[PDB]
Structures are given as C-alpha cells and as structure tokens.
Amino acid sequence: SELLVNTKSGKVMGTRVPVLSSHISAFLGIPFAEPPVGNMRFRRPEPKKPWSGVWNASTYPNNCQQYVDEQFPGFSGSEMWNPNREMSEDCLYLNIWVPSPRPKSTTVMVWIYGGGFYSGSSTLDVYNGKYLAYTEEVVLVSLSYRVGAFGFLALHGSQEAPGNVGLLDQRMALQWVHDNIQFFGGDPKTVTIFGESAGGASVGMHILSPGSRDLFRRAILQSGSPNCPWASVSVAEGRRRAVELGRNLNCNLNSDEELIHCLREKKPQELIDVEWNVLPFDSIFRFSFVPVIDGEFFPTSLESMLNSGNFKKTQILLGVNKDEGSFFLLYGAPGFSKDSESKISREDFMSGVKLSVPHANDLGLDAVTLQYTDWMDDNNGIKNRDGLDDIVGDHNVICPLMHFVNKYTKFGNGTYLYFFNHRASNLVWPEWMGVIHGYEIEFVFGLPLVKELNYTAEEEALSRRIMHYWATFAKTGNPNEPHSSKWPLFTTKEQKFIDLNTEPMKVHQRLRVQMCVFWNQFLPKLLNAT
Amino acid sequence: SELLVNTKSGKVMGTRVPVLSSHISAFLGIPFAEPPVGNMRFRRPEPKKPWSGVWNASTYPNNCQQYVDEQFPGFSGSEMWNPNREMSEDCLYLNIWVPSPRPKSTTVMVWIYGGGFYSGSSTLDVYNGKYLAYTEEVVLVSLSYRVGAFGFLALHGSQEAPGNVGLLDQRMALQWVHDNIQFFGGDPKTVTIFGESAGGASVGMHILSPGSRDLFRRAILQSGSPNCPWASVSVAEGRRRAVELGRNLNCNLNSDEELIHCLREKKPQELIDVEWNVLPFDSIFRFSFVPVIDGEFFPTSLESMLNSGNFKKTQILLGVNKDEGSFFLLYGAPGFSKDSESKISREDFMSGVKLSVPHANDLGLDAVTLQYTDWMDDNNGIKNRDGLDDIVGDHNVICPLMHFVNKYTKFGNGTYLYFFNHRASNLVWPEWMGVIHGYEIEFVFGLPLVKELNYTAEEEALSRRIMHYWATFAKTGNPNEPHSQESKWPLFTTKEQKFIDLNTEPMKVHQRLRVQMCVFWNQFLPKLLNAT
Ligand SMILES: COc1cc2c(c3oc(=O)c4c(c13)CCC4=O)[C@@H]1C=CO[C@@H]1O2
Ligand SMILES: COc1cc2c(c3oc(=O)c4c(c13)CCC4=O)[C@@H]1C=CO[C@@H]1O2
Ligand SMILES: *[C@@H]1O[C@H](CO)[C@@H](O)[C@H](O)[C@H]1NC(C)=O
Ligand SMILES: *[C@@H]1O[C@H](CO)[C@@H](O)[C@H](O)[C@H]1NC(C)=O
Ligand SMILES: *[C@@H]1O[C@H](CO)[C@@H](O)[C@H](O)[C@H]1NC(C)=O
Ligand SMILES: *[C@@H]1O[C@H](CO)[C@@H](O)[C@H](O)[C@H]1NC(C)=O
Ligand SMILES: *[C@@H]1O[C@H](CO)[C@@H](O)[C@H](O)[C@H]1NC(C)=O
Ligand SMILES: [Cl-]
Ligand SMILES: [Cl-]
Ligand SMILES: [Cl-]
Ligand SMILES: [Cl-]
Ligand SMILES: [K+]
Asked: Which residues are within 8 A (CB) of B74 and not within 5 positions of it... i.e. 6 or more apart?
C-alpha cells in the first residue's frame, strides 16, 4: 500500500526499514534504464521498458563494473568505498527512501556518488539514505551511473561510443525522478541534486548542460566542481585514450567501428585490468575515462560557458574539506605511508610536485615549488609533507571550486560556501592526512546519529546541523531557517564562507585567495606562455 | 715636519685640522691623475706628471661634473649629497687623513663614494675622514672618479671612449696609494677599499678585475655589489646609449670618431642636460652611464667569473640597510611624497612595479606582483607602499648582494655580513622611508661622535662599534677583537649563512637574509624572463 507504488514503467514493492527507533519506506534497486549490456556497451542509455507484475524493490542492486582498490586489504578506510554488491554491467538502478507516513509533496534530494568517474556505488554504507530522509523529512534518491571505459570511453563522431554516457545515465535517472517521484510523495519541481568529488563535478556538469537544466531545481557540490583538471578531457584526448585502450587489448584499430566492436567482445575485467595504462603521464589525481567536452552535452568549453552565463541560474551550496589531497598522495607519491608520519624529503617533494602537476613544464614546476616551499626551513619533512598535501588539494579541488564559485556567483541566484575542517574522533587513517577526502559525507548522511558507530556528542550535533542546512537549502534555496546565527550569502564583493566544525560558526572571507590566484591566474598564464 | 710630505710625484703640504678636542693631519685635494680635460674627455686616465714646488693640500678639491639634484631646494636630506664644491672636469684628486703623531706603518682604508655612477663627491660632510682616522688610528683616504658620460661613455672598439674610465680613475688612485701611502705612515700591504652603493659595486668590481686585485688587501661593501642590475650594461647597450647621447645633441653619428669628437666639443652641462634621455625605459633605480662588461676590465661575464672563482680571494665585510628602495620611489614612482605617509593605491602599485622592473615582460610583472601582494588585503595602502619599497630594495640591492656573498663565500677567505636596521633619531626624511639608502654612512664615519649634530648616546655607542668593526676588520680581516668578552659577529658560511643586525640593541645573529624573496629574484625570475 504505502509500500506498493505504481510508477510509469510499472509497479514497485518497497520494504519497511528500521531507522533510529522509528521506521520508513525504502525502494531499492529500481530500474531507470535498459541494461547497457552486449551491443549496448558504450552507448547512450535507453529508457527502461515497462514491466508487468510487481518489481521486488526490497534489496540493493548490483554495482557497476569498476576497478577495485586492494591496496589495504581488510582496512575499513579504503574498503568502505569499494563495491559491497556483485558487480555487473547491468547496474542502472536507483534507490529511494520515503518518510513514513508518506509526505504529500515534499523536497527531493538526489545523491550522485563520486569515485573519479572510474568507481562508485549507490549502495555504500556511507550513502545509506534512511537517516537524512527520516531526520529531515525529505525524499532521498541515490542514482547510479556507468564508470570507467563503460561510462566514458569517448570516440567523438561515432554514435556507438559517443562519450559522456555515464553523464547521460545520471540525466536519465533525473528524468525518471521528474516523471515518477510524485508517486512517492515527492515534489518533482523541488529536486536538489547533490554529490561529492566526481559526483560534485557531475552536479556542476548538469548545471552547465542545457539538456539537464530542467530536471532539477537547486544544487549542492561537495569537494568537486565541473572545471576540475581531472574531471574532463578534450575530444582528441578521449579519442587517444580509447585507441590506446584498444591497443592494450590487441584490438583492430582501422576504424572507430572496428575498435568499438573489438572492445565490446572483451570481458569487463579485461577492460579494467588495463584501464590505468592509457593515461598520458605518471600522475596522481588523474583518471582514465572521464566526461569529454564534445559540443553536445557541453555546447562549448566550460570556461566560455561560465563567462557568458550559459548555465542554470539558481541557488547553489558548495564547499571543500581541509585536506582534499592526502588520500591521493598516499596512493601514488613517494615517501608517503599509512603507517607513519610520512615526513617528506626534498627529493620526494620534487618528485611529488611533478606527479601532482603532470601537465607543467619545468618552469611551472619551479613556480609551484617556490610557491609552497619555506626557504628558511626547506629540509623540514613535516612542512614538505603538508606542502604537497596543499598542492594536491589546492590544484585539484579547492582552487577549481573557488573559480567555479566566483564565476557562478556573477550570474546565479544565491551562493552558499563552506569550509569543512572537523578533526575526526574515530581516527581510521593516520593524523598527517587530516580532514580526508569524503569525510564530510558521514555527516551529510547522519552516521553520527547511530550510537553503535561511536561518534562523539559534538559530532552528532554537527551532523544534525549539516543535515538541516542541506535539507533547508533543498527546500528553500537558503540553508538558514528564518530566525535564530546565519550562514551568509557568498557575494562577488565580500566572498564570505563559513567553517563547518564543532565550534560556533565563524565567518571568513576569500577562501585560500592567495594560493588560488596562483592556480587560477598565474600558473595557467605561465603555462600558456612558456 | 709632519705636514710636509715628499711623494713620488712632488712635495705636498697638508694642514692641521681639529677633531674632538685633539688634532690630526689632513692632506686634501692631492692630484693623482692628469686633468682629463679637452681631447682627454672620455679617455683612460694618465698618471699625474711630477710638479715642482710644494702642492698646497690644505683645501678640498673640485667635484666632478654631474647632475645636481634639486627636487627639494633647501632640504638637507637631498642637498647633503650634492657637490659642495665647484664642479670641474679637472677633478681627479684624493684626500688623506693621517693620525698625529704620524704612525709608522699603519692600516689604510680608502673610501669610494656612491651616487649611481652619475654623481658623488669625496668632499661631502658625511665623508669627512677625520673622525674615523682619529678614533681608530687608521690612515683614511677618500678618492674620486669621473661619473656620468665623462666616466662611463662606452663605445667598445674605440680607444678614445672605451668605457670604464671612471673605474680606471679609481684604479689609478689605488695605484697612487700603493706607491705613496708609505710616506704618510700607511702600510700599502694593508689597504682596505670601502664604499657604498655605486661605491660598493665598485669595490666588488675591483675584487673581480685582474688589473685591480694586487692594489688592495681586502674589501668592504655597503649596500652595493658588482652584479647589481643597475651597476653595469653590455657593450651593445653602452654603445646604444653613447649613440643616443649623440643624437640628443645633434651629433654626427657616421663613425665613433665623429661622435666622440662632437661630444668632446660640448660644454659639460650640455651632456648632463640630456643624460637621462638615453635610458631604454621609463624606470626607477636605473642610471645612464655605468661600467660596461668589456672583456678587458672584466674578462668575462660577472656571473661566469663568480662561478669559476676568478676573482680576488680575501676577506670581505658587507651588508645592506633595511629600506634600500625608499629613496628611489620618492623620486620617480606615483603616489609617493616626502610630506605624506604615501599610502599607495592598487593602480599606483601596478605602475610602481612596472617602473621597478623595467626589463620584465607581462608574465614577469605578474610574478613580481603575485610575490609581493597580500590578496586578503590587496587595497591596503600601507602594505602596497611597503611592498613596493621591498621590491625596489630586494631587486636592486639586497638580492644581488646576497647572490654575491653566496658566490663569493665558496672561494673567499672570510665573509662577514650585516643588516643595518637603525633609523636615526634626527632624520629629516618621513618615517615611511625607514632606514634609508646611505644612512649607515654617518655611523661609519663617526658623525654621531659630534655633540652638535644631536644624535643620541645610543647612536654614539653604535657608531663607535661600527667604526671599530670596520677598522678592526681592515687591520686583521676580522671585525672582532679576539680575546675580548664582547658579543661575536660570526663568519658567514655557505652552510649556516649567518649575519648580524646593526642597531642600538644587543646583537642578534640571524640566518638566510631575505632568502624567500631572493630565491624569487636570483633563481625564479631570471629563469622566467629567459623563457619565450
Ligand atoms: C593503479 O593506479 C592507481 C590506482 C588507484 C588510484 C589511482 O589514482 C590516481 O589518481 C592515479 C593512479 C591510481 C595511477 C595514476 C594516477 O593518477 C585510486 C586512488 C585510490 O584508490 C584508487 O586506486
Ligand atoms: C631625471 O630623472 C631622474 C633624476 C634623478 C634621479 C633619478 O633616479 C633614477 O633612478 C631614475 C631617474 C632619475 C629617471 C629614470 C630613473 O630610473 C636621482 C634620484 C634622486 O636624485 C636624482 O635625480
Ligand atoms: C524479494 O526478495 C527477498 C529476498 O531476496 C524476499 O525475502 C522477498 O519476499 C521478495 N519478495 C517477493 C518474492 O515477492
Ligand atoms: C534571486 O532572484 C530574485 C527574484 O527575482 C531577486 O529578487 C534576487 O535579486 C535574487 N537573489 C539573489 C540572492 O541573487
Ligand atoms: C563501539 O562502542 C561499543 C560500546 O562501548 C563497543 O562495544 C564496540 O566495540 C564499538 N564498536 C565499533 C564498531 O568500533
Ligand atoms: C694654502 O691655501 C690656504 C687656503 O686658501 C691658505 O690659507 C694657505 O696660506 C696656503 N698655504 C701656503 C703655504 O701657501
Ligand atoms: C683563510 O686562509 C688560511 C690560509 O690557508 C686558512 O688557514 C684559513 O682556514 C682560511 N680561513 C677561512 C675562513 O677560509
Ligand atoms: Cl538504525
Ligand atoms: Cl553578488
Ligand atoms: Cl669637531
Ligand atoms: Cl664556508
Ligand atoms: K557497429
């Protein structure tokens, strides 16, 4: 009844789930597209054909085919991000948490997972929607989308592997929410999309893309923006990588069509085993198959779109963590370790800036180096480690987001900026890594509310503050509830943002302005010039 | 007879001068070269021909022909640097202060004035040698040399205007000291050369130049070094400037000989009037006629000599003042004034940067701007004013000196480095200007020892220890008296890079003087400008 919902493509049977000494409705693994399998691998998604009988939506779906991180087997900090379900190319499903009793026509929030466009699943423990749905009385959807080659292999000109299909999967799940969320007590005219890292880049891509604009009301971007240097490639670079993928797998390369058909015969894991090989450099925070600037999903370059105001004009709320870079150093840079303080020698710092800014010539490397080195104390391994962490975080996440926020604000209808800098109580990773990539997510999804998870009282209270900011923003375009201490609008002139931690709200201005002028104005001009 | 000296070119009669209620001997205006006048303008100097009779050396000589600053008429802060004598091309003279009674074979110090190679005089109040010679028992000499076109017009290939003749004037006075100072009870094997700004750059050029090396024992450089961006030009640029000078005066330019002949027939003032017109750019801290890298006085590039250790190996003492740039902003950059706190707008900061680094491409200007701008507070008038001051000082004096001292220390026999950061209590310049270019000189020359000049007792104590450092260094190669219980000025070393503050407070040792900004100026900027 409450659990039996007739949607436009057929009937779905949800399940009653327990949540914090209460209950709500969960509809898990709802198909939004035809399975993109067989001759459909690499192609645009097709809408899910209607089924008869009742779809069993009591259970999480398969995760998409992806690289699986095995660097630290057994370790919760890496393993929480890996698939917790069987992987299958048949993976285009969404999940819904509905407050019980069913609300009339409430704010909808649609979560878009990150994972670098090469991994991610809607079914991770940290994305369990039941807490945010219950606490904030919203309808929470998590979508999925193809990642890696399967989602982003790009041979522009071909209708067979056009590129961007993972982005179209997201848009098709959005369309499905627009067409069906009213059946779950959701208001399709009050949809917020939100996601982290690649999911945040994704959110900003749908703001930019004219085909996505009318499928949501408002947006939240966490530690990601569309212009991130790792978040897109040119059609020529996507093409090179796709030919190199085929080269790796002994494919016929005489034609797009021959390459594409060879690659469709390959077992999924065969694609995944060689995925990292197509990258043009030794690097970190670079992923193989990502969105392409194709002239279709994105009519023109992201920069020209941002400058002309060719994008959705609405309210956005976005921000970054203190130490975005540290996870990536740990994986790919010399001298770093999970099990030590990771004091970085000068030799390893040099080799790290090269890996961090793989597109830089020698002059740009020197420029980066000079900008983050304290020459009164250059053999300090602690300042060398933190310096590298800041390079990776500033270059890849913070400064692109600041460029996006400054460009967006000129045209949009209200910007709210945050700086997430809370030090964990349950320290999973070592201290040197600080406020890690993805850590704010636990707070957004209300995991600190679960007593069995052993967060502190101050963390429960912060999670509740964050959920309420997020949901209130989703409802109104403003994270603040009229009447009382206010998170102020980010404005072009004043550039105010807030810290998000367990202390009373403090307001600052010009987040990392000094390093971000280096990354957004001077380096690009140096690289354009030399 | 103490006052009557027979030198190698003739007799000299000096004068008993009073000093701090004692007396010493002064020999003022001794000629060391033929008057470089007439057909000798621009030529290498020639040794002074022996004269008959007794040379009256009781009064200061003429000052060399030079641009005279009159931005601030009647103002002692600018006017103290202008010629206080009649100007003449007949100007190659030296001055000597000798303790009374005459010492046997004592330490010699020889002062080389600054003034950007376009100005300066041995006769200024602030260079009065009597305080230092008396107090430290040293034989103190001040030399002179031709400045501006007269000293530095450079037409490489001609032996009529070869360039660097002002440096050869200095060499010749050094040679004269070498040959004659024994007659004044000086030891010619213990000569320290010292000078400020262009004077300091000159000292460094003598260190480098094979033809000067054997003419002094060791060297002090104040706020200047040979590698300063303003202190030299290429043969090509010297030539361009000499020809631009001709063009300004409607000279015949068809050949060097015609150009030089034309320029020799002009009155000195005609050259001076257009002197500033030959500079390639609108600029700050740039001077028209300066030493040229010729392949003679300088066998190869300053940088290649410094790297190979092709230069005099000895002891050096050197340093800088806290605000080297301020004087130069006052004169040429927009929004500066001596009668206001000179809060600088963003727009005038951008203009100042361009004037300060006139050789820079757009990208280079951007790097300078970025390196010196607080983007949390980019409209701060005070931070923009100080930023500009730091740029001008870091680029023109501090970072070149630091590059020099690092390069020198690899091969030399002892380096002592100072940072002078005392602002004098009786300064007539506004506070914003801080510790100005040239203002350590009066301490070096012991002016705070005169009660009527109204310095503090702390300023007197400071001047006494500066003079004692300088002279003790001149005597021994080490500013410290061994066995003394005093705070010790440590050697500057490649590894530790130590220096001292010189001020009215107890001594503090620091390390890596302005290392952050000087890596930018000495490594990153040139690499960037050299890029295309
Ligand atoms: C096999 O090489 C890589 C493996 C890898 C990553 C990588 O992230 C990167 O940014 C990156 C590489 C990575 C190789 C080159 C590169 O840039 C993820 C980080 C954490 O887990 C993921 O596992
Ligand atoms: C006519 O232009 C100038 C006059 C001038 C100076 C200058 O110093 C400079 O560094 C400079 C100029 C100067 C013009 C261009 C330049 O760089 C001395 C400063 C103070 O007194 C001197 O007088
Ligand atoms: C849906 O699946 C679960 C187990 O996978 C089962 O317990 C539930 O009853 C199913 N619903 C059906 C078969 O109608
Ligand atoms: C949003 O648009 C409204 C309605 O036109 C307008 O009043 C206001 O200027 C905008 N709000 C912001 C914060 O830009
Ligand atoms: C959390 O705390 C409980 C109660 O003290 C304890 O029994 C348990 O070991 C902790 N759980 C986890 C998953 O760390
Ligand atoms: C030398 O010149 C001075 C000053 O003009 C004069 O007073 C003095 O009498 C002269 N001495 C001799 C010996 O002629
Ligand atoms: C200077 O030279 C002498 C003679 O070789 C040597 O003993 C001394 O160590 C040198 N001192 C320095 C500080 O280089
Ligand atoms: Cl629960
Ligand atoms: Cl605004
Ligand atoms: Cl007196
Ligand atoms: Cl050493
Ligand atoms: K085909």
From this structure: none
Which residue puts its alpha carbon closest to atom 14 of ligand 4?
Answer: A413
Count other Cβ atoms within 10 Å, centred on residue B339: 7
Residue pointed to by tokens 């069995």:
A452
Burial tier of A18 (Cβ tally within 10 Å: 0-12, 13-18, 19+): exposed
A20: left (phi over 0), alpha (psi -120 to 50) or beta: left
Residue nearest to atom 1 of ligand 4 (CA): A413
Contact B509, B490 (CB under 8 A): yes
Q: Which residue of B has its CA nearest to A524?
A: B363
Residues 6+ apart with CB under 8 A from B381: B343, B344, B345
B319 within 8 A of B417, measured Cβ to Cβ: yes
- Nearest-CA distance A530 → chain B (Å): 6
* Residue to mutate (ligand 6; options B58, B60, B62, B85; most atoms within 8 A of CB): B58
Phi, psi (degrees; rounded to nearest 5) at B112: -120, 110
A530 in contact with chain B, both atoms CB, cutoff 8 A = yes
The conformation of residue B523, written as its DSSP 8-state character, comes to I
Q: B-contacting residues of A 345-374, CB under 8 Å?
A: 363, 366-367, 370, 374
Contact assessment for residue B513 and residue B432, using Cβ atoms and an 8 Å cutoff: no
At residue B498, the 3 state secondary structure works out as strand
- Rounded to whole angstroms, the Cα distance separating A226 from A229 reads 9
Kindly write down the DSSP assignment for every residue of B32-45, as one continuous string: -B----GGGTTSPP
Top-tier CATH class for A1-530: alpha beta
B523, B403 contact by CB (below 8 A): no
The pair of three-digit structure tokens given for residue B128, joined into one six-digit string: 């009065």
DSSP A491: -
Q: What are all long-range contacts of B494-499, with beta carbons under 8 Å and residues at least 24 apart?
A: B494/B406, B494/B409, B494/B410, B497/B406, B498/B417, B499/B319, B499/B417, B499/B418, B499/B419
Where residue B219 falls (left for φ over 0; alpha for ψ -120 to 50; beta otherwise) is: beta
Based on the number of CB atoms within 10 Å of its own CB, is A37 exposed (0-12), middle (13-18) or buried (19 or more)?
Answer: middle
Q: Is the dihedral of CA B367, B368, B371, B377 positive or negative?
A: negative
* Rounded CA separation A260/A160 (Å): 7
CB-CB neighbours of A376 under 10 Å:
13
CA distance A530 to B524: 14
In chain B, where the domains are located:
1-532
The resolution of the experimental structure, rounded to one decimal in Å, is: 2.3
Interstrand relation of A496-500 and A316-321 (parallel, antiparallel or unpaired): unpaired
What the block records as the tokens of A135 is: 């606490």
Could you tell me which residues come within 8 angstroms of residue A158 by beta carbon, excluding any fewer than 6 positions away?
Answer: A256, A257, A260
DSSP for A256-269, please give it. Answer: HHHHHHHHHHS-HH
CB of B284 sitting under 6 A from ligand 2: yes
The 3-state secondary structure of A333-398 reads CCCCCCCCCCCCCHHHHHHHHHHHCCCCCHHHHHHHHHHHCCCCCCCCHHHHHHHHHHHHHHHHHH
CA atoms in the 13 A half-sphere facing the CB of B92 = 29
Asked whether the beta carbons of B18 and B134 are under 8 A apart, the reply is no
Residue with tokens 């800036």: A353
Task: Quote the minimal CA–CA distance from B522 to chain A in Å.
Answer: 12
Q: Please, is A368 exposed, middle or buried when counting C-beta atoms within 10 Å of its C-beta (0-12, 13-18, 19+)?
A: buried
CB A31 within 8 A of CB A92: yes
Contact A522 B366 (CB under 8 A): yes
Does the bond joining A299 to the residue before it have cis omega, within 30 degrees of 0?
A: no
Q: How far apart are CA B371 and CA B375, in angstroms?
A: 10
Rg (CA), chain A: 22
Q: Which CATH class is domain B1-532?
A: alpha beta
